[PDB]
Design an enzyme around this catalytic site. Structure first.
Site, PDB file in Angstrom:
ATOM      1  N   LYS A 186     -62.398   3.680   9.139  1.00  0.00           N
ATOM      2  CA  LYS A 186     -60.899   3.568   8.934  1.00  0.00           C
ATOM      3  C   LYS A 186     -60.400   3.504  10.372  1.00  0.00           C
ATOM      4  O   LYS A 186     -60.586   4.417  11.088  1.00  0.00           O
ATOM      5  CB  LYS A 186     -60.517   5.057   8.680  1.00  0.00           C
ATOM      6  CG  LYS A 186     -59.022   4.970   8.270  1.00  0.00           C
ATOM      7  CD  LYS A 186     -58.253   5.619   9.595  1.00  0.00           C
ATOM      8  CE  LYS A 186     -56.710   5.232   9.979  1.00  0.00           C
ATOM      9  NZ  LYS A 186     -56.680   4.269  10.905  1.00  0.00           N
ATOM     10  N   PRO A 187     -60.237   2.124  10.712  1.00  0.00           N
ATOM     11  CA  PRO A 187     -59.804   1.753  12.112  1.00  0.00           C
ATOM     12  C   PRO A 187     -58.381   2.434  12.233  1.00  0.00           C
ATOM     13  O   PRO A 187     -57.660   2.727  11.500  1.00  0.00           O
ATOM     14  CB  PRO A 187     -59.616   0.288  12.161  1.00  0.00           C
ATOM     15  CG  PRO A 187     -59.943  -0.139  10.743  1.00  0.00           C
ATOM     16  CD  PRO A 187     -60.240   1.132   9.835  1.00  0.00           C
ATOM     17  N   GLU A 262     -65.872  12.828  19.532  1.00  0.00           N
ATOM     18  CA  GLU A 262     -65.484  12.704  20.905  1.00  0.00           C
ATOM     19  C   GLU A 262     -64.063  12.682  21.252  1.00  0.00           C
ATOM     20  O   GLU A 262     -63.411  11.867  20.363  1.00  0.00           O
ATOM     21  CB  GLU A 262     -66.273  11.503  21.525  1.00  0.00           C
ATOM     22  CG  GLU A 262     -66.169  11.415  23.022  1.00  0.00           C
ATOM     23  CD  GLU A 262     -64.846  10.220  23.269  1.00  0.00           C
ATOM     24  OE1 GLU A 262     -64.837   9.131  23.327  1.00  0.00           O
ATOM     25  OE2 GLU A 262     -63.951  11.013  23.754  1.00  0.00           O
ATOM     26  N   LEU A 263     -63.402  13.510  22.113  1.00  0.00           N
ATOM     27  CA  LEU A 263     -62.137  14.035  21.897  1.00  0.00           C
ATOM     28  C   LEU A 263     -61.523  13.854  23.398  1.00  0.00           C
ATOM     29  O   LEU A 263     -60.593  14.447  23.585  1.00  0.00           O
ATOM     30  CB  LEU A 263     -62.262  15.346  21.548  1.00  0.00           C
ATOM     31  CG  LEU A 263     -62.816  15.622  20.254  1.00  0.00           C
ATOM     32  CD1 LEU A 263     -62.864  17.197  19.852  1.00  0.00           C
ATOM     33  CD2 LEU A 263     -62.032  14.727  18.953  1.00  0.00           C
ATOM     34  N   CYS A 296     -60.799   7.781  27.258  1.00  0.00           N
ATOM     35  CA  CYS A 296     -61.407   9.088  27.432  1.00  0.00           C
ATOM     36  C   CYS A 296     -61.949   9.594  28.477  1.00  0.00           C
ATOM     37  O   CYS A 296     -61.752  10.914  28.853  1.00  0.00           O
ATOM     38  CB  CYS A 296     -62.333   9.193  26.125  1.00  0.00           C
ATOM     39  SG  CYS A 296     -63.923   8.277  26.218  1.00  0.00           S
ATOM     40  N   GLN A 343     -47.362   7.500  22.552  1.00  0.00           N
ATOM     41  CA  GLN A 343     -47.916   7.482  23.837  1.00  0.00           C
ATOM     42  C   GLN A 343     -47.393   7.191  25.006  1.00  0.00           C
ATOM     43  O   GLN A 343     -47.396   7.832  25.842  1.00  0.00           O
ATOM     44  CB  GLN A 343     -49.233   6.690  23.700  1.00  0.00           C
ATOM     45  CG  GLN A 343     -50.376   6.783  22.797  1.00  0.00           C
ATOM     46  CD  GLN A 343     -50.799   8.305  22.931  1.00  0.00           C
ATOM     47  OE1 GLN A 343     -50.775   8.922  22.117  1.00  0.00           O
ATOM     48  NE2 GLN A 343     -51.375   8.405  24.246  1.00  0.00           N
ATOM     49  N   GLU A 393     -54.741  15.970  28.930  1.00  0.00           N
ATOM     50  CA  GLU A 393     -55.024  14.583  29.132  1.00  0.00           C
ATOM     51  C   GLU A 393     -53.633  13.814  29.070  1.00  0.00           C
ATOM     52  O   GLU A 393     -52.669  13.851  28.185  1.00  0.00           O
ATOM     53  CB  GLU A 393     -56.001  14.118  28.036  1.00  0.00           C
ATOM     54  CG  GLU A 393     -56.412  12.970  28.024  1.00  0.00           C
ATOM     55  CD  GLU A 393     -57.513  12.559  27.074  1.00  0.00           C
ATOM     56  OE1 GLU A 393     -57.078  12.783  25.986  1.00  0.00           O
ATOM     57  OE2 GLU A 393     -58.445  12.038  27.235  1.00  0.00           O
ATOM     58  N   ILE A 394     -53.273  12.854  29.917  1.00  0.00           N
ATOM     59  CA  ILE A 394     -52.246  12.008  29.921  1.00  0.00           C
ATOM     60  C   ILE A 394     -52.556  10.875  29.130  1.00  0.00           C
ATOM     61  O   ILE A 394     -51.567  10.357  28.283  1.00  0.00           O
ATOM     62  CB  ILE A 394     -51.807  11.745  31.208  1.00  0.00           C
ATOM     63  CG1 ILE A 394     -51.584  13.165  32.118  1.00  0.00           C
ATOM     64  CG2 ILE A 394     -50.606  10.763  31.500  1.00  0.00           C
ATOM     65  CD1 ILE A 394     -51.637  12.778  33.708  1.00  0.00           C
TER      66      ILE A 394
END
Ligand SMILES: NC(=O)c1ccc[n+]([C@@H]2O[C@H](COP(=O)([O-])OP(=O)(O)OC[C@H]3O[C@@H](n4cnc5c(N)ncnc54)[C@H](O)[C@@H]3O)[C@@H](O)[C@H]2O)c1
Ligand SMILES: CCCn1c(NCc2cccc(OC)c2O)nc2ccccc21
Ligand SMILES: [Cl-]
Ligand SMILES: [Cl-]
Ligand SMILES: [Cl-]
Ligand SMILES: [Cl-]
Ligand SMILES: [Yb+3]
Lengths: 494, 494, 494, 494
Positions: A186-187, A262-263, A296, A343, A393-394
């Site tokens: 699922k892109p 992976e986060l 990431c 974002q 995380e920016i």
């Protein structure tokens, strides 16, 4: 040098890919896909939802059945198919890099020379493993013959983010397929286009139908259907910490499917006074500003020994002031837009937090341009560990630089985060390089470099930056299921 | 602290050990065994020859037969037997270290705290591998099931030297037995005694008869019978380069048995100007003077950057002048004798070559004492690459120190030898440590240390310093024979 | 289906290949190369001798130097070069299979569909390993960081036989190059031609000069120069047991170079009464008659349970009577010539031994034809363990069939040989298949099949059939040299 | 033979074990522990809750800190500590087996000869791995040196069930400790006693404080505090499918800790007509009746080819009628109680479902005795795939026997479950054994045996029977966290 596409890009593949055929959505609904540098719609795409995921899983299950072509073909032939796919992506490298840049807001120079090269190299690496996946023969107690099969797991659902669409696609399907799994991908809703073109090439390469199924669509809809699906054996995901938790909870609630995540991160650099200063400034800069900060492993906390802190800051500001913003397809442009409004808002809000919480703004600090989700490259000095720009995380072009004088203490500060994806250490001292790297709680530690990723290396997070590893020898383990076969025999011999 | 034996040592085991029973020589002949510190006979030992080796091989073959206890017992039980043997050597540590020191001329402090500890640790390490030796299941092309067995090879002949009798005994039998082989061991004619005591403990531990056979005797007699034996599957050897060639030639001529050799060295150190100078002086000193220079990895060529050469030489001379010669059993004695007259002559002749060929004698240079094969610890400065003391393994307490100023050139000088066992690099610079160690043609490279050997590390030579590796995971490969089993099946599935 | 070359084959490459350039022999001498089916000369080839080997070794040494292109290129790029070479051999498959058949006397059907396919598949398999060769990080005792490098060994001399010229060429250079070695290859004097064409393709693929050097010539001349060369680090060889001994002796005498050998066999089959009889007859037939019996693993002793022996013999004779002899290039021809007069004489002499020693001749037994080294396919019944045709490798189309009734005894008979390359077991019983295969002293054991060889499987002999293994994961070990690097650190952490 | 304790058992250790000291509960509360064969209280134990888990985690975190004794000691010394622990459990084998039998309702014969032996063997197996856990050196693209560390993860919470208290304790702590982790263990509320005695022996063995912490208490209280704890890096669990989901959901919600689960099964046997019938009846019987049916791998669905079904059923009924119920400590007693009232009720309810849904009751079917949670051993014939006794794990002495005639169909029936822990195949046919075992979706498949578990074999579930593997080489992976270290260098060489 840097070749380009000589005719304008035409979009062709906009449908759901199941059993190597193109499907409309069950609902009939489509959704728009935009260019982040212009805010203009590029095309419409079939919107996958739970009913379409259900179709893709049934096809992936059927392709995984004992006796099927994908289960019975030689491992070496799985590898041949992956090498051919890499050959085809190489053939279409100009088209794919252009499409990647236009849909993803990604500098074309980087898309062509880095993303596409990494996709090709990673596929060829994975191809080579396919007939080298091996189990064991085991000297068990008693009169038995015991061996193990490292089987494929089965149907793997693979949820991909928007920041590296092709590279994440290949990082997911390369090892999964090499090991013999079938996949439902699922892109990102923002960036379906390059994945659907690769599905064109999976058909062309000759993969059996149902081995790869691609279902474009949204997260809470098609993504959640994968998460909670009762016949998906494993889900892999790269993206936000918040979705990771929603996926792990969904998996536990439904069928206890295997989950790897992976986060992202809040990855720190430690720069000792004896470091090659220019080399450290350059790598940390690239670490945090690469792909407009939407990496990431962004080097988003840079601790510098006080002795060299002011020179480090000054030299980082100078390098940050040298960028050219604009459309990622024009030569010489060196910074593209952020991916979308969410974002963009998040980055500007965090930049403001930095101002209000007392950081020293050295350059940037605001938006840019008439159109496109552009953010000025921004550097903060005198950042402290409590501020939001130090904790969160920016995912934007926003660099934080802090001072330390005690090495014991700066290691605790570097480790004092729930993140844990990567870190960097800059020193000439052998002993410090080894002991610092050993002490940092991070999945990859770079020494006198940053951001060096390769197919031969396992990659993944400590702590809340994720679980499991991707690529390398080690990452292949997470796409197999180990079966122990133990046979009674009359008498064993060593 | 350093405990000692409280009653004088009495020698008990002097016979050939076959099928766990004690045998006179077929000939009836015995041979003397001496103390190198006194030149006095300690006892007589049964002299094994070809007829006795023939008896030991037949017993080792019978213990290796399919269906035998040693072939059919659990791997984990092979490991238990090796752990029990280690427990027993621990029990007899005082006796064994005393016997080792008295027969071998070996400082009792070192025999007790280093040799015996290494024997115990190595055995326990090998015990742990026994049920972790595994083959593979392999995704071969076609409809076949293919697996591999890492079987033991069979009967292994193991020729041991006199400089580390117990440690070489255990380095040989530990991995051989862990993998399931049977062995015929021929200890050095100079030092049979500790091996025969260990044979006492192999019986006591419960090893099946014929699994370990020990045949004391001479090289050209019992050693050559092993080399050329038509029913020994493998021979392992540590000792001179000259015998290695005679063994390899003997093996080729008879039954093409597998051969692994470790053959000494002319191991170099490279000391860069940025090195911790005192740490480098101490480790290089220990490297070349340990056990009176009778170490395979002796650091017998020390290249020092010109900037620090004179200080390095001065500090090495000071440390070499601090030794106390005498009987290796008296506390505070810090240098024992050489092993025998052959080695003693060889050392003195090479020392003389150094004088005549133009080396600078900084200290030592002659023999010592009324009795015992004692050599003054000797340091040569301004050594050049052509001299005999730079080319030939000395195996005595004789240190060579050379100057360099070009790093490219000193690496070629370090590599310009047919030896290749080990090397040392002394620098604080990360890049130099990695690239120099990568460029040196040596089996073990120490960085900012020297002489660090452990059971977890493979150990062996490049070039004429030998072939194959001992200990570590990797060394276990050389005690197995791989069999591929390929089974026709109606249909395979991944 | 079976495509053919549409224009007649023209020979182009007849010179020595060094530093990617074509060299005349230092002597100026050339030697003839013949077609074994016609006894006619095909062309002349430059005759390499010690002086030419010396040139090839110097080039291979220079290409292996630290800092060279072949040492510094990415492992993944070594793999790319090997995949490209496989692509090129695929391109030239028709030409290579034709040349192989014409020079080697090899059925064109087999050369095209088996030899060439195996060459291509093996190269692609080896390509995949190149960037997956890995050392270890090791938790040594003490405050040290210890890692290992699995380096290439260096210059590898590779002596190839005439029975599988291309396949042996690729089995040798594929793993050697994948691991990073440089090679000096000496093809069989009878069959240099396909190797020199492959050297054309090594240049075309882009391998750095000196990485592969091919020196056609004779055994006692160029082969012995490799064996005894003081700057070749390793030699690998397939061929006669007698040369293996001469090579091992030469290696021991010169520089103690590493040696791996594969030396043929006297491989047995055991057919139990419960076996699928037709399947067993077919596989054993193919095992012994493949490529006119000129296979290392020929199934040259077939033991059959008495219950089914007469039916087994009868059915084997029927299948042996169905062959068509003639030129290996004509469609429908099913048996070609032997390679040369030496082998032809040896086969006929051994056939005569069978008659005189009392074997039962069931069919064949003599030569065939006006020209070409043709032998009638020959079957002997009631063979006993003492006869020459039971003890000696024949390397011709000559099948031996024996009866047994005690399974214990037939395993001892199967094992009662100094050979040990392979074996076959035919039974439906799980327990018998496992325990028999475990008891046989043979490197590969086939169960209910025979002659199944694949790149993913290690392959090599027990006992005098050779030492070491080729291909598979395990075979790559023999093309690396392990270096242990041990770094002193202030404090280690798990 | 079967030795016994000669004085009555006295309970000593009833408190919480943290930092190697004994703690009262923070609340002051205690809870009763009962004997399931008498329903009588044995003693009271400190009741751990979230506040006590918090104390244990802080101690485990402190013992895991960089620079701590447990982090800095040699790997080989971790292994020594585990071998000593095994030695101590061996010493206390009589006491531990008695306590296990009395608290757990476990036949003393089995507790002494199987559970305790497996605990000792598993510990010794794990000890051997400690200094054999290795990372890699990796030939990454570019001029970099890349190695990996297989570090311990950190603080591991380990929730243990009541059916194999000691064995599950050791299966959890053996690999965790060998790899260098620290642990917080929560034994079953029903069976804390043997774990607290082992904590006595962990202190006695010399493990550093905080390395092992044991917190007895209840599931929803202390178990859930582990599940949701923000400073536990990993949780492992064996027990119900329902709790597994609650743990995975808790982990996702809190800190995304790593989770491995083993969750029971509905494991099938397939008995072909050619099977050794008696051997198949015996192993399937033992499979389902072992430890009163309270085994994860219970063989709770037995499919038998129709040809032999009636004989199979008849022979299974005969063997089930031979049991003696009573106190698990009296010699000759062959079936003990179920563990508690919950499990007892669940078994009787499921037995009733079998009657009402139409199964054929062949023997048993009700409770037994004046006291104790005893269930008659019960056999059902003509079971169909829809019935509750075919779908639900019973965890009682209740055998289901079904007929099949189509092998394709019976494999789908065997696989038609969300469980997937294990399976058994009974046939003499090689091909069927391999292809059936390959087709079954189960973590361990036994061929012509059942229930064969050993430390050298990885063990775990497919599908909802769990995720990850325990023991073997492979299970050690789940107790390490891989870190990639990538060092910039001036020039790399292969
Ligand atoms: N796989 C196995 O070997 C195994 C073992 C026991 C039970 N089971 C299955 O579970 C069924 C019910 O037995 P049970 O209730 O005693 O098992 P359970 O899963 O509830 O208990 C096992 C362990 O999990 C703990 N636990 C319970 N609730 C918890 C919670 N909310 N959070 C964290 N930990 C918790 C328990 O205190 C105990 O330590 C059995 O009938 C059996 O089918 C399987
Ligand atoms: C029916 C098998 C009973 N059984 C035992 N018996 C004790 C035992 C014996 C040998 C080795 C052991 O450890 C490797 C060990 O634990 N352990 C089990 C773990 C899970 C499921 C069933 C188990
Ligand atoms: Cl495994
Ligand atoms: Cl293998
Ligand atoms: Cl290694
Ligand atoms: Cl790794
Ligand atoms: Yb009751």
């Amino acid at each position: 040098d840097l070749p380009v596409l000589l005719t304008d890009l035409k979009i062709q593949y906009t449908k759901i890919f199941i059993n190597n055929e193109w499907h409309d959505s069950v609902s009939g609904k489509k959704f728009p896909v935009f260019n982040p540098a212009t805010e203009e719609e590029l095309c419409q795409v079939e919107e996958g939802d739970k009913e379409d995921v259900d179709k893709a899983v049934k096809a992936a299950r059927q392709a995984f059945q004992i006796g099927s072509p994908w289960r019975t073909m030689d491992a070496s032939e799985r590898g041949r198919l992956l090498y051919k796919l890499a050959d085809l992506i190489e053939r279409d490298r100009l088209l794919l890099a252009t499409m990647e840049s236009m849909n993803g807001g990604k500098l074309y120079s980087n898309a062509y020379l880095s993303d596409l090269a990494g996709c090709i190299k990673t596929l060829r690496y994975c191809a080579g493993w396919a007939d080298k996946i091996q189990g064991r023969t085991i000297p068990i107690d008693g009169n038995f013959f015991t061996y193990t099969r490292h089987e494929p797991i089965g149907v793997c659902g693979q949820i991909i983010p928007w920041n590296f669409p092709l590279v994440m696609l290949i990082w997911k399907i390369g090892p999964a397929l090499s090991c013999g799994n079938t996949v439902v991908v699922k892109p990102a809703e923002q960036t379906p286009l390059t994945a659907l073109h690769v599905a064109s090439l999976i058909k062309e390469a000759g993969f059996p139908p149902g081995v790869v199924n691609i279902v474009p669509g949204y997260g809470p809809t098609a993504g959640a259907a994968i998460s909670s699906h009762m016949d998906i054996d494993k889900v892999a995901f790269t993206g936000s910490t918040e979705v990771g938790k929603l996926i792990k909870e969904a998996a536990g609630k439904s069928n206890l499917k295997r989950v790897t995540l992976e986060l992202g991160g809040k990855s720190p650099c430690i720069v000792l006074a004896d470091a090659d200063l220019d080399n450290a400034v350059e790598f940390a800069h690239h670490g945090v500003f690469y792909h407009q900060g939407q990496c990431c492993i962004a080097a988003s906390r840079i601790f510098v020994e006080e002795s060299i802190y002011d020179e480090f800051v000054r030299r980082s500001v100078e390098r940050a002031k040298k960028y050219i913003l604009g459309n990622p397809l024009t030569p010489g442009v060196t910074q593209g837009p952020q991916i979308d409004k969410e974002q963009y808002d998040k980055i500007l809000d965090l930049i403001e937090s930095g101002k209000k919480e007392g950081a020293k703004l050295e350059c940037g600090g605001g938006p840019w341009g008439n159109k496109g989700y552009f953010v000025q490259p921004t550097v903060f000095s005198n950042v402290t560990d409590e501020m939001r720009i130090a904790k969160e995380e920016i995912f934007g072009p926003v660099q934080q630089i802090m001072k330390f004088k005690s090495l014991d203490d700066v290691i605790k500060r570097a480790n004092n985060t729930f993140y844990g994806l990567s870190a960097g250490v800059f020193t000439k001292d052998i002993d410090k390089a080894i002991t610092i790297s050993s002490a940092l709680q991070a999945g990859t530690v770079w020494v006198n470099c940053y951001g060096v990723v390769s197919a031969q290396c396992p990659f993944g997070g400590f702590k809340m930056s994720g679980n499991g590893r991707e690529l390398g020898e080690y990452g292949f383990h997470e796409y197999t299921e180990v079966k122990t076969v133990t046979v009674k025999i009359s008498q064993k011999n060593s």
